[PDB]
Design a protein around this ligand. Structure first.
Ligand code: B4K
Lengths: 350, 25
């Protein structure tokens, strides 16, 4: 069956056009709605269609966010179209997104099943691209709130990583409360466990640190069996937070007395042959104090990514690395002078 | 469950209980 719809381009102009697609199949289902895979009739290009129930009287948070973003490390919104929801206010919003065949989750699972660690060059490549996508979204005040390997899409040949699923994302505004029960448990920042509602985009940096640690370990670093058990898992590594760290996580939370537990050494958390720069980076992301975590741009400039800035760098398959230095004024806005460190001499315009 | 965490947060007993659960196993 060939489906023809009138759809609006994702970036702009707001001028609708006929879009035809075929080979429709369900590739995901959840509370949010349904995700389909389809093929565009014009170009033969594969797309993902996310279908969500929408309130007519309200703007869709996910669409608003998606229409703003144009970055090589974020799944592009090609088109969007509305479909009839039967009920007066109920309509369905359909997001036509670029299809990406793999995930960091599946790639890491493959290596984990084979009892081998993902090669360090891919850990550098995937993590660097994730930090770039985070630097970009955070510059608009957008927090993803669901950073996990499953939401990190991969083109297996080019090693291009694209951040997906903006279903939990929100444009954070200081002084406007946010829900504390957010994120996929294993990747949930400790301030969220402590019930903070005044949190920042640094919760995504905690989650990025969890992804990194997982790529190094071959399993999640903090596999909590519940919300309370999630903190138990964190304490086994970080030890107990100090009175100052508690205040920094949630100033509305007070705990009179508690037994103090020392941190477990980072070098013992990981396997002996773990690259020390990867452990060092990880120690600067998985911090109780949210403001002490590296910003995504600071993480991109970390010495762990120095190999990516080498002019002679190549993928193990022999191909060139994807675009790594095409930074924009928007992406560099949090710290513009950092550009001269992030953009190596060989990458600069002739 | 989720009710337990909310209660621990409101009562200010979250760290004490997490430390107890660590030692319990
Ligand atoms: C197997 C697989 O994951 N395929 C996919 N290709 N592209 C995808 N895009 C999204 C997706 C959903 C919601 C968003 O807001 C978004 O930007 C992107 C989810 C899955 C895919």
């Amino acid at each position: 069956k060939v489906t023809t719809v009138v759809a609006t381009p994702g970036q702009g102009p707001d001028r609708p056009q006929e879009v035809s697609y075929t080979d429709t199949k369900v590739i995901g289902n959840g509370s949010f709605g349904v995700v389909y895979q389809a093929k565009l009739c014009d170009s033969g290009e594969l797309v993902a269609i996310k279908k969500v129930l929408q309130d007519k009287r309200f703007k869709n948070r996910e669409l608003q966010i998606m229409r703003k973003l144009d970055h090589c490390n974020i799944v592009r919104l090609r088109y969007f179209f509305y479909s009839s929801g039967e009920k007066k206010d109920e309509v369905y919003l359909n997001l036509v997104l670029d299809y990406v065949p793999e995930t960091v989750y599946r790639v890491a699972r493959h290596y984990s099943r084979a009892k081998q660690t993902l090669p360090v060059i891919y850990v550098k490549l995937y993590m660097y691209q994730l930090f770039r996508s985070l630097a970009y979204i955070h510059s608009f005040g957008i927090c993803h709130r669901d950073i996990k390997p499953q939401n990190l899409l991969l083109d297996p040949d080019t090693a291009v990583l694209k951040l997906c699923d903006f279903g939990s994302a929100k444009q954070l505004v200081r002084g406007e409360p946010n829900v504390s029960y957010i994120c996929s448990r294993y990747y949930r920042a400790p301030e969220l466990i402590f019930g903070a509602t005044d949190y920042t985009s640094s919760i995504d940096v905690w989650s990025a640190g969890c992804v990194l640690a997982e790529l190094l370990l071959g399993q999640p670093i903090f596999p909590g069996d519940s919300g309370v058990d999630q903190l138990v898992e964190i304490i086994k590594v970080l030890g107990t937070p100090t009175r100052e760290q508690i205040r920094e996580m949630n100033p509305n939370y007070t705990e009179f007395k508690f037994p103090q537990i020392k941190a477990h050494p980072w070098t013992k958390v990981f396997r002996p042959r773990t690259p020390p720069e990867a452990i060092a980076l990880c120690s600067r992301l998985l911090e109780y104090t949210p403001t002490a975590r590296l910003t995504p741009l600071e993480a991109c400039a970390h010495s762990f990514f120095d190999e990516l800035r080498d002019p002679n760098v190549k993928l193990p398959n022999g191909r060139d690395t994807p675009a790594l230095f095409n930074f924009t004024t928007q992406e560099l806005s949090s710290n513009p002078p950092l550009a001269t460190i992030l953009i190596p001499p060989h990458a600069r315009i002739q | 469950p989720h009710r337990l965490l909310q209660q621990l947060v409101l009562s200010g007993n979250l760290i004490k209980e997490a430390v107890r659960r660590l030692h319990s196993r």
